[PDB]
Amino acid sequence: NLFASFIAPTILGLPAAVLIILFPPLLIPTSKYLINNRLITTQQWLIKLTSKQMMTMHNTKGRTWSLMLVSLIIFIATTNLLGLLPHSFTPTTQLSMNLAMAIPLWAGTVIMGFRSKIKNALAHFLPQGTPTPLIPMLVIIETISLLIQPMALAVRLTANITAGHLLMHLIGSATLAMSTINLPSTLIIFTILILLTILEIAVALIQAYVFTLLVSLYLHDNT
Amino acid sequence: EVKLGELPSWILMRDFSPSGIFGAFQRGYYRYYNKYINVKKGSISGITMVLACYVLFSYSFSYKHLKHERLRKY
Amino acid sequence: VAYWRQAGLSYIRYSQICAKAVRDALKTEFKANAEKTSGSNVKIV
Amino acid sequence: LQSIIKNIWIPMKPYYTKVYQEIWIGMGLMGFIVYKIRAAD
Amino acid sequence: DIDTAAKFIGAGAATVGVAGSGAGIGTVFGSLIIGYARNPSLKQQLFSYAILGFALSEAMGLFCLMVAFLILFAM
Amino acid sequence: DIDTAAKFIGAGAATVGVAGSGAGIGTVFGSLIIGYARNPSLKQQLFSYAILGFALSEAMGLFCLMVAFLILFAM
Amino acid sequence: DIDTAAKFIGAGAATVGVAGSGAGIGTVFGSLIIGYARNPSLKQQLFSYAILGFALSEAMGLFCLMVAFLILFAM
Amino acid sequence: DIDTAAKFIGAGAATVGVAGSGAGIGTVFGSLIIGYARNPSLKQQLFSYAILGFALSEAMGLFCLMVAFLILFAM
Amino acid sequence: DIDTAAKFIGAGAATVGVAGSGAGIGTVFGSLIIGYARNPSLKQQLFSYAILGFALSEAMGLFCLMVAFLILFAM
Amino acid sequence: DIDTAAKFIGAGAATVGVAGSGAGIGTVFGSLIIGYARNPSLKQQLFSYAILGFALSEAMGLFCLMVAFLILFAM
Amino acid sequence: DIDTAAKFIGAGAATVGVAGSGAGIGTVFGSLIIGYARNPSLKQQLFSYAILGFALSEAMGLFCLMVAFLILFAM
Amino acid sequence: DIDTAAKFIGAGAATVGVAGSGAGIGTVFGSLIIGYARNPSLKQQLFSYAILGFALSEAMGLFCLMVAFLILFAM
Amino acid sequence: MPQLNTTVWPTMITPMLLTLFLITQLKMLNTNYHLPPS
Amino acid sequence: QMSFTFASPTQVFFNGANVRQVDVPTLTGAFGILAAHVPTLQVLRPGLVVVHAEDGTTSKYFVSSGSIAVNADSSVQLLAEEAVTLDMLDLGAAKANLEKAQAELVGTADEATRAEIQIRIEANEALVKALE
């Protein structure tokens, strides 16, 4: 009854969760022209400013992912922002979807660190200026954290959009309860919901930039 | 095309193929895109009208849940 | 980075106003003597 | 079914073959996890 | 029931970990105030670090709300 | 009886998480004193960062009163 | 009566939240001693930010004493 | 009786609030050392801040001992 | 009966050790902001330490989260 | 006997306030290093502040161990 | 049983000591950024102090994880 | 029995005190890197304080690992 | 927690892969930045 | 151990003298300088300079600009562009010119020529607090 906005949506027995995951790309029109409209002029600028941010820090092999790590910050920042609409089912609150964006991009990042350049990837586990006599303890950290980075991504994003929606939905129910009670209090609980919606707008973008930065930093440490 | 027709045969006149109704969306998209989005000096209302038709859809499947929270019973 | 450095000035221009301010607050017994021992006469071509 | 080659795979050809080759090796790992998680449930 | 009663103790104890991330957001947004009064020309590059420090510290608090809700509701 | 009792043990133990927001607000308004004594011309630019760092502390302080509420009322 | 016994551990554990407002008033008046040593000319304006930063951190501390005095006396 | 057993865990948990006033006095008398080593000509004024800052820090720490000695003995 | 009830309390306590990493990652990215604003020509080498610090503080917090589950699920 | 067994919890939980002092002594003797690495000709007077700070925080770390020994044996 | 039950709250609360080594590794690797932004020509000697501080703070974390795995499987 | 059960909860909640001896050892060696990078001419005398601070904050951690091994083995 | 109902996971995994990897990228390959002229 | 050197462009106050402490108004905030102080180098802002002779007896000059440079061998070189002892400044013109400076700012809006007013304002603001 409380987690209702996270159950897979179905209308007329049809799994409507597919027309919701495939919609974000519909808000990004493209054109071959040279001078287009305001939408594609602002979007092609954001993609320019974004790609120059995540990708500048990479070498030539890391920059071959400049289509992936840009088409990923565009898909997470548009799925989150389409979740703040009323009653909307944002599929980034799903541990299934988030585990499907996290494991491949991570596994495909350490594999290229183990299928090639492996002898160099063996040197990140042991920092440069490290004395020896307590190495058999540090080996646990750099591996067990590596083995849990793919689950850090998918849960840092799941637990931040879920908890952001749960809070806005509870504080919302508060204003509904104090509506039939002292009303000058309703307006102070509501203005908390407004400052909270401006926060959930920012955390809708920040959680997209951090997800695609930590996938970038994993890549930078394997190319 | 409709908005000037009057017959119930038009419902069966159309091309109801897997490629048929797609061309009715791809033409229904370019008729909208060209009207509100694909103009210089376009306004934000080309988008805030898609979201408004995306909430009504996000609410339509979410009505089977909100009905358990009515504050009346009649 | 102070505000004047953001405003284009340099520490020489900063010091010229701070030192002018001290002399402008000197008393008349010393203000005449102090102004000519530090006044400027050089000129740019 | 043409232009599914030209519009849909001709562009993605240099990526789906060379660049994302190790992605799929990871995407197999993921599919093994999802089925296993659903197998124990 | 002692099993359903022990859920409220763990769930209420699990969410104490949000005290950590509530104290690391004051360090970040406190360091931004210090680091911006020393090089106010870097205003945009510092704020791009207050953001990464915000989300990576706050994330560690929600890992406690995860177990606060994994216990309280989903056993 | 134990079910309605195990809530005060879980509710009170959940409003501890706002301790972190008492230290996060200290470090924020503690760096506004250090950052303003360094560049007293940015008194209005820094103070707007302190209000931002202070507001974001209530954010992680509310995530606790939520789980302190659910345990208490909406079990 | 396991009811009023759980109202003791509630107030007893809900008052641990004051450990934040004890280490937040330490960083406000601590960083006032540091910031005032650098620019002692602003003694007045710094002390007006300490009182503002001490209260905003102590407020988040009294809210725990207000909660501990609800689970104990009100309900 | 269980109340006599709950008053012990209620008090033994309230005294954890003193852990704040123990890290908040190390930040006041730790920022007097950093603040005095810089400008040692203000020793008689930096100190009279490290007494206000030390009194406003143990105050929020002795509340948690007053609460302990209010649960443990005095109802 | 109680052997499972204790696995909801022992797991709710183990997961509060993550609060030590919500404050660690804040100190790491609260120093990447200060340290940068002083020497902004070492951005490539400071960030390479803020990541080493973010990974080593998070690696301690996630030990708690692993003992949280290794108690709640394995034994 | 539920009370004699409760004393082992209230006395084992009161002694975690010591973790506040132990963190406010590393701040003091970590500020004595930052304040002596700047003005080392003050080594005499700094060390007479790193003892007033060490002996004022570690007094709060003893008020906790005072209640830990007040519940464990004095009752 | 009540032994196999309480040995989960014990080994589940003993592992909160890792919350120390979470914020001790965040300060060591946080101040290493500030120690390097100041004197980058000592990068080899600084990083050898960070690894000493990372191995002595984490060792206090292991001493807690060592106890939780002592009152669980050893005895 | 009920005692041998609570003896594990008290000895577990007491060794959380090490969480303050892990944030101290972190701040001491966090200032040894900052203080030595500022005045590297004092390497031998700054390090002679970072050993005192290491031993004095870790002395409050032993006070908790001692009261843990008192309820656990002595009584 | 309804995220754990693993019966509707393949309904979230496949339409994501069909978007993150084929439809969103295809629309990026159409966004090109020509080099400036003399 | 300290080798002070305080000198105006036209006057020398100390030269190689052994004072125990100086309190200078650096732009990054004032600090006091005893022997073996960490090597630094700064630039002053208007404010006092208190010089503590070995006898514990002070001496108070009002510098206006310049650059102090503590060195590795405990030598100090304080150079003030205009360093007048407090027995030469007056309180009336400081408060008056500060008003003529403050009142002239509000009538100005250009970033450059208003920046030169604030520097004159703080130079006079630091004057009234030095005299009394």
Ligand SMILES: COc1nc2ccc(Br)cc2cc1[C@@H](c1ccccc1)[C@@](O)(CCN(C)C)c1cccc2ccccc12
């Ligand atoms: C004024 O205080 C705030 N400032 C904020 C600033 C920013 C943001 Br984004 C959220 C803020 C939220 C609030 C309160 C608030 C007021 C009304 C409704 C909801 C929330 C608060 O949450 C305090 C948060 N602290 C204490 C954890 C609160 C919650 C519950 C009960 C309260 C009782 C009394 C006082 C405050 C109470």
